Each structure stands twice: as structure tokens, then as C-alpha cells.
Ligand binder design. Structure first.
Ligand code: HEM
Ligand code: HEM
Ligand SMILES: Cc1cc(N)nc(COc2cc(CCN3CCC(F)(F)CC3)cc(F)c2F)c1
Ligand SMILES: Cc1cc(N)nc(COc2cc(CCN3CCC(F)(F)CC3)cc(F)c2F)c1
Ligand SMILES: C[C@H](O)[C@H](O)[C@H]1CNc2nc(N)[nH]c(=O)c2N1
Ligand SMILES: C[C@H](O)[C@H](O)[C@H]1CNc2nc(N)[nH]c(=O)c2N1
Ligand SMILES: [Ca+2]
Ligand SMILES: [Cl-]
Ligand SMILES: [Cl-]
Ligand SMILES: [Gd]
Ligand SMILES: [Gd]
Ligand SMILES: [Zn+2]
Lengths: 400, 402
């Protein structure tokens, strides 16, 4: 009943007792495992259990304020069918939802998160101001700070607050008459929407898209980001002088804007959150994936590698140097970044901390292990258990 | 519906209808996924046997034929009289290929139809067992042009012990528990090393001493057999442009030959059935030489490369690991020993998935084992969603016989 979990480098054994509290159901069955797939009024009951967590979390369970909050939420839903979080409960739910994210390797940071309460928002012009506060605060001139801004919860009968962009900062993706893409291929859909709802297309490879913000029961509105607000890093290499001339750049702040936040039965469909980057996210996935910028062969040609036989490992050598360029360029510009060795070493520490805090830690091995040098990191050798705890971030249908 | 599967590099979508035919259950539940864990009766014999016979007769496009009806009836009668049955030779060849085809953690399954099957079911002693194995090693090594092969020893049957091969692989390097607590040699092989000494093997003291074989005939303690040095093809490691690398004095063996799994065909179980293919270079380069709990040479190579090992942000570990993998591929190709790099291996596996989709409507695959241990997202299988499940016939783990 309690999964035995082994670390093969060390030989250490633990048992995951927290997986018993798995509140929902994942995609796997005894017949088949689907862990590799990317996407695979009684509201009182969720509301009740989250409060118990909260008061247990502050060592005030069954106590005075515990029983009062319970009858409070009961009355609020009885009167309207929904209820309101205390600002502190909102802070706690935000951090827990990060803490419970099985696919995030950055969770050693989960206690330090800046929660911006924006539930008093209405109109997209106010969304936009909340967002620029967030962006300015989180960027902090390159010394990055984690943050989330929470827009009003979904409620019955009412529209919804949605940010149509998947991230707050995204490069455009233009299609050409030869079928291909100039810019970021992942953004061809959001880019044509931006154009169609007003935006004037640039023509470069790193044109920052506008924001398509949507307030309850109106069409979305464009909002162009001030250029001094969006901090970017020109990519250069410590020793390959031609690398800079490739013209590659990326942005400082990874800020995800299209995931739904869920707390004690409440659902916040706009709650963007930001941290800082792991270097492999930029250098390996964003620039070297075949369906993203796909620059691997360009760099290999420039390094004078032999590209007509797979066994010279030219793909591997070019990838490492692109990651070195990324790390060097962010450091040179004093923008917070973390390499996959340091990050995976801190996730090991987080697993050990959580093994003592709550008896385990939900983790998705395929997303924890970095996309280069897998077995050179300690998490490759760590067995992991993936389950869904609440509160949580979840994917959600596109707003169309 | 069946599980919808997506390739993110191409955009394409398939449905894995084959998984619906999964018999034995895996370790996952709707509560929790254990996909990352390494190691998580007459009427059931007949239903497995029946299903296997049906598979065979589909393979040769003779389903429903008279021979198909008669072989089912034949198997039914033998189980009713003896409680077990015997495979025809053709069923055994087909069964061994299907088990390979069904193995979710093997990336080299493009080759599953080209497998040499040695029938050793009439083996009667440990000496005959050793002779079958030397012939296997000789056939498969083939002086460096490796050929896939399996030797099937007699099946488990009631009232008699199993044939077993105590070694996990036919060729392994000794790992000597050093006196100060460390290890000289391969640390993965400390247990089997100590069992060889205790069974009368006089050990050496190198880092690359080939272990002898411990073979167990039914109801008998294991017997010790020395592999003839001329049978064990080994490759000295050198680097194409790092001339000091040869001074490390690194070697690895040509032939990867797994000897401790159980083969299961139509309900029958073969506790000894060693199989061998050829290496993927990351198994030697990354895992066997750079795992911290294996030969753990990564820091030493990095210093000799004059890399800045005092901070992770220079990516010295990645750089050294690449050159170790370069050395392995260069050294095998120089010695004329078959080897495949992880880009070629994973590209051929993508071709296999597409054939299997057309042939059977799916393919069981364990993503964490198919994605190679370096450069994952640079290979195409990284971006391929996969469904993991158990089909039979199958290769299975089994308890250590001691
Ligand atoms: C502060 C430093 C952080 C680092 C280095 C980091 C790193 C990562 C990485 C590498 C992933 C895998 C994403 C991918 O490659 O597609 C991920 C996923 C995720 N992160 Fe973190 N992250 C950080 C902060 C945060 C914060 C502040 C939150 C929320 C409060 C968060 C919530 C999540 C969630 C929900 C996912 C899952 C998204 C998905 O499934 O694609 N992370 N993170
Ligand atoms: C012909 C070239 C072959 C290549 C390149 C190859 C490659 C591999 C690799 C890289 C793995 C992962 C193993 C690890 O990381 O330890 C694996 C596993 C496996 N292979 Fe293959 N293999 C080949 C032939 C064969 C053959 C001939 C068989 C059986 C007839 C076979 C059956 C298996 C099985 C059962 C596993 C999984 C073992 C486990 O669960 O630990 N392979 N193979
Ligand atoms: C705060 C933070 C820090 C950090 N360092 N990194 C992240 C990245 O978080 C995500 C990354 C991705 C990319 C993976 N992929 C994109 C296309 C797809 F949506 F189709 C499937 C998922 C999707 C998400 F939703 C995410 F939250 C977030
Ligand atoms: C035929 C063949 C070809 C090839 N190219 N390669 C292989 C490697 O097959 C295995 C290799 C190993 C040793 C590596 N390691 C042992 C401990 C562990 F079990 F924890 C994880 C795997 C164990 C197995 F069972 C295997 F099938 C086999
Ligand atoms: C198909 C496969 O599940 C998919 O490529 C996953 C695998 N692991 C990943 N890991 C991270 N960190 N990010 C990803 O987008 C993915 N993608
Ligand atoms: C804990 C983890 O599952 C373990 O280290 C696995 C990961 N993936 C692997 N994949 C392959 N092919 N071989 C392995 O030994 C492993 N080890
Ligand atoms: Ca045209
Ligand atoms: Cl990104
Ligand atoms: Cl091996
Ligand atoms: Gd040049
Ligand atoms: Gd040289
Ligand atoms: Zn699973």
C-alpha cells in the first residue's frame, strides 16, 4: 500500500505515504501506463478539506478560528453558491499549488512566492496594469523574484478573466508562402489572432507579441508591452566569437499565463505566475527542438562539425555549446538563471525536505529529468511517484 | 476510446488499440503512477496457450485453418493429461521473437524479426549448458560483426529444479570489495564477484577482470566455468583526438548478453534463456563509465581535458561525457565491432513504432527507458508520447536464485 521508492546511486529507500491523500485520479490504470502523455453545492467538500489543511498548516486545527471559518464558508455558499478566500488562505493556496506541481523542478523555492491579490479587477485595461506591476516586480532589473497575480475567480452566471497568450512574453510566429515559419513556430496560432484582433505584424525572428486580455463578456483587447518593460538577453558565447552574430536572443522572465489555479473548490482561470529559467529550457528546448527555433544545425555548421554521420555526436556537441552560450549570456547580463546540474541538485534536497515534512512528494520523472545530460544529474537515479494533490495548477481549454 | 498518442515534433496523432489486449497488470493506478520504478493451474495455462497458438497462426496467415484447429486440440489434450505441453520448434522461434517485439524497455526492436534461436531444450547438465553458451557467444560475436541470438534451455516443469544462470550477463567485469570500503572494478558486480570466489574462483586484481560463469543444473548447486579468453572480444578505448585518453587504460567487452531473465511463451516458462544483441554506445559511455556508482571516470576525464571543474555552470560534466561517448564509438568502429549511437538507435525505433502501428495498432514502450541517458530531447523519441503495457510472450524479471 505504501510505494517503496529507491535511489539507485545511493541505495537509499523511502516510502511515499503522502500518495494516500491523492485527491483526484490520473490517467494510468493497471492495464496501461500513460505517464508520458503531456495532456492525458457539494463544492463544500473541497472547501472544507482545504480549510483543514490550512489550519493544520498553522497548527490551529479544531481550534477557535477553525470552526468559525467553516460555518463562514457554509453561509457564503448557502447565500450565493460560492465563497471568498481570506487573503492569507489565498497566499497559502498559491504556495501549495506550486508545492504540489509534479512537473516543476524548481520547488525548493516554494516558500518564497510573492502573491499579488487582483480579485478586485474588472476591465482589461486594469488587467494590463496588474500585469505590468507583476512584470516589473518579478523582473527587478534582472535579479528575478517569484510571483503570482490572482484575478477574480470564476463564479456562476458570470463571464471569465482569461489571458489568451500562453505566456506573458512570447515571440511572434509568421507563416511564409513556402509553408515555413519565421519566428517561434509554437506561436503561429496566437500570432494570427493578435493580427486579427488588431495587431500590426513585425517581420523579425524575435518580435514580442502583444497581450490579448479578455474580461468577462467582452471580446479580447490588444495591449502592447512597453519595450523598457520586457527585459531580454542577447546571446553570445564565451569563446566562439561568431555566436553573437547569429542574432539569437531570449527573454528574462518565464511567466505562464494560461493555467487555471484551483483552491478549495474555487477556480481562478487567470492567475499568471513567474519564476526564473533553467538554462536547458532556453538552450535545449526553445532553441534546439526541431519544431521550435531548430538552430542545432546552424551552430554545428559554424563550429565546423561533421554533420553527415550521426556518430560524431555533432548534435550533442552543438547542444552543449548553445547551453554554455545561454548560461554565459545570462550571467554577463546579471539576469537570474540556473543550470540543470544546480537545479536537479536542489530538487534532491527538496525531496528530502518533503520526505520529512509530509512523507513524500509528487513528481513526474519525465519532466524532472533535464532534456540533456539526464543520467549526469542525480534525479535520473531517483525513483519518483506522480499523483495529484490539491490545491493545484491545471491546464484548461483555450478560450475559443 | 483507446489512448490518444501524439508526436510533438511532427504534430501527428495515433490511437493505441493494442493496449486493450494487455493481459498482466502493471504497477499504476488512477491514484498514482509508478512508471519510473525499476522493479515495481490448468485453465489459465490453456487460455494463455490458446492465445499464443492463435498468435502463431495469425503470424503465418493461416488463422482458422485445419492445422490451426488441430494444434489447439492437440495442446488441449496434452495439458489435460500431463498438466503441461511442449512447443513445436516453429512456435518456439516465433515465441522468442514475439517476446523481444513485446519488450517495452528495448529501443533496438526494429531488429526483432532477425533473431537466431538456438533450441537447447534437450540440455541435461551444467557442462552441456556451458557448451551451449560458448557456441552462443561464438555465434553472436562473430569476430566483431555481431548477430542477435537467443539460446532457450529447458522449460520449468513440476518435480524438478530450474536451469539457471547465476550471472546477470554472460560477460561482466569483476568488482572486488576493497578493504577500505571502496571497489576495484565494476561496483555493480560486487555480489556476483563474491559468489564466484566463494565457489572456488581464484580472483585477480584488475579493473577489467572477466568473471567466470556460475551455471545451475536442476537440483544441483552452481558450477564454475571459466570463459576462454579467445571467446571474450574486448575493445580498448581511445579517443580520436585525445591521445592521453588511451593512457587511462579503459576497455569494454563486445557482446551484451543478458542471462537472468525468464522467457514466457504460451504460459510456459523458461528460467534460463540468455539473449544478446549489440551495444548502444550510451550504455557503455554514459552509464557504465560515468555513473557515480559505476566506474565513475567523469571528473578525471574533465581534469585531463583541462575543464573548469570547480563550478557546474561551465558544463564540464556534459563536455566530458560527450567525449567519453565519442571515444566509445570511435573505439568500437576502429576495432570493427558492431555498435550503434543513440541518434541512429532512436531514429530506427521511430521507424519501428510506425511499422507496429500499421501491423498491430500499437506498440508498448517505456518512455523513461527508450529516451537515451544523454541528449534526450535531441532524439526523436523524446517528443513521442508512448503507452506502456504488458503483452505476452514476454521477457520477465525473476528472483535471484540464491
Ligand atoms: C523559480 C524558479 C523556477 C524554475 C527554475 C522552474 C522550472 C520549471 C521547469 C523546468 C518546468 C518544466 C516545464 C517545461 O520544461 O515544459 C516547470 C514546470 C512548472 N512549474 Fe516551475 N519553475 C520555477 C518556478 C515556478 C513557480 C513560481 C511556479 C508557480 C507558482 C511554478 C509552477 C510550475 C508548474 C505548474 C509547472 C508545470 C507546467 C507544465 O506542466 O508544463 N514554477 N518549472
Ligand atoms: C540488436 C540490438 C539491440 C540493441 C541496440 C538493444 C538495446 C537495448 C537498450 C539500450 C535497452 C535498455 C537497457 C538498459 O539501459 O540497461 C534494452 C533493453 C532490453 N532489450 Fe534490447 N537491444 C538489442 C537487442 C535485444 C535482443 C536480441 C533482445 C531479446 C531477444 C532484447 C531484449 C531486451 C529486453 C527484454 C530489454 C529490457 C530489459 C529490462 O527490462 O531491464 N534486446 N535493449
Ligand atoms: C514559472 C516557470 C518557471 C520556469 N522556469 N518554467 C516554467 C515553464 O512552465 C510551463 C512550460 C510549458 C512548456 C511545455 N509545453 C508547452 C506547449 C504545450 F502546452 F503544448 C505543452 C507544454 C507549458 C506550461 F504550461 C508551463 F506551465 C514556468
Ligand atoms: C540484448 C541487449 C542489447 C543491448 N544493447 N543492451 C542490453 C542491455 O540490457 C540490459 C542491461 C542491464 C544492465 C543495466 N542495468 C542493470 C541494473 C538495472 F536493472 F537496475 C537497470 C539496467 C540489465 C538488463 F536487465 C538488461 F536487459 C541488452
Ligand atoms: C512526449 C513527452 O511526454 C513530452 O515530449 C514531454 C517529455 N518531458 C518533458 N519535460 C519537460 N521539462 N518539458 C516538456 O515539455 C516535456 N515534454
Ligand atoms: C530511477 C530510474 O527509473 C532509473 O535510473 C532508470 C531511468 N531510465 C533508464 N533507462 C534505461 N534505458 N536504462 C536504465 O537503467 C534506466 N534507469
Ligand atoms: Ca507558392
Ligand atoms: Cl519557455
Ligand atoms: Cl551493460
Ligand atoms: Gd570558418
Ligand atoms: Gd590531440
Ligand atoms: Zn503510469
Amino acid at each position: 500500500k505504501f510505494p517503496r521508492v529507491k535511489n539507485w546511486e545511493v541505495g537509499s529507500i523511502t516510502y511515499d505515504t503522502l500518495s494516500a491523500q491523492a485527491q483526484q485520479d490520473g490517467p494510468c490504470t493497471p492495464r496501461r501506463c500513460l505517464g508520458s502523455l503531456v495532456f492525458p453545492e457539494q463544492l463544500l467538500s473541497q472547501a472544507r478539506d482545504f480549510i483543514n489543511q490550512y489550519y493544520s498548516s498553522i497548527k490551529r486545527s479544531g481550534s477557535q478560528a477553525h470552526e468559525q471559518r467553516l460555518q463562514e464558508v457554509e453561509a457564503e455558499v448557502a447565500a450565493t453558491g460560492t465563497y471568498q478566500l481570506r487573503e492569507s488562505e489565498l497566499v497559502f493556496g498559491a504556495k501549495q499549488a506550486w508545492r504540489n506541481a509534479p512537473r516543476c523542478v524548481g520547488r525548493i523555492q516554494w516558500g518564497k512566492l510573492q502573491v499579488f491579490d487582483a480579485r478586485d479587477c474588472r476591465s482589461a485595461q486594469e488587467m494590463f496594469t496588474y500585469i505590468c506591476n507583476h512584470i516589473k516586480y518579478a523582473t527587478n532589473r534582472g535579479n528575478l523574484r517569484s510571483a503570482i497575480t490572482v484575478f477574480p475567480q470564476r463564479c456562476p452566471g458570470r463571464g471569465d478573466f482569461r489571458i489568451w497568450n500562453s505566456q506573458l512574453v512570447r515571440y511572434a510566429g509568421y507563416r511564409q508562402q513556402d509553408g515555413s515559419v519565421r519566428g517561434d513556430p509554437a506561436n503561429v496560432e496566437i500570432t494570427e489572432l493578435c493580427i486579427q484582433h488588431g495587431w500590426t505584424p513585425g517581420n523579425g525572428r524575435f518580435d514580442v507579441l502583444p497581450l490579448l486580455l479578455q474580461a468577462p463578456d467582452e471580446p479580447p483587447e490588444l495591449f502592447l508591452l512597453p519595450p523598457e518593460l520586457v527585459l531580454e538577453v542577447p546571446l553570445e558565447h564565451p569563446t566562439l566569437e561568431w555566436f553573437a552574430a547569429l542574432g539569437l536572443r531570449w527573454y528574462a522572465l518565464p511567466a505562464v499565463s494560461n493555467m487555471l489555479l484551483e483552491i478549495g473548490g474555487l477556480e481562478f482561470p487567470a492567475a499568471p505566475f513567474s519564476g526564473w529559467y533553467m538554462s536547458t529550457e532556453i538552450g535545449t528546448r526553445n532553441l534546439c527542438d526541431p519544431h521550435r527555433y531548430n538552430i542545432l544545425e546552424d551552430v554545428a555548421v559554424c563550429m565546423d562539425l561533421d554533420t553527415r554521420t550521426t556518430s560524431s555526436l555533432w548534435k550533442d556537441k552543438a547542444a552543449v555549446e548553445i547551453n554554455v552560450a545561454v548560461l554565459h549570456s545570462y550571467q554577463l547580463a546579471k539576469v537570474t538563471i540556473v543550470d540543470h546540474h544546480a537545479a536537479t541538485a536542489s530538487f534532491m534536497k527538496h525531496l528530502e525536505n518533503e520526505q520529512k515534512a509530509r512523507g513524500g512528494c509528487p513528481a513526474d520523472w519525465a519532466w524532472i529529468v533535464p532534456p540533456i545530460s539526464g543520467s549526469l544529474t542525480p534525479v535520473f537515479h531517483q525513483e519518483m511517484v506522480n499523483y495529484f494533490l490539491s490545491p493545484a495548477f491545471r491546464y484548461q481549454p483555450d478560450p475559443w
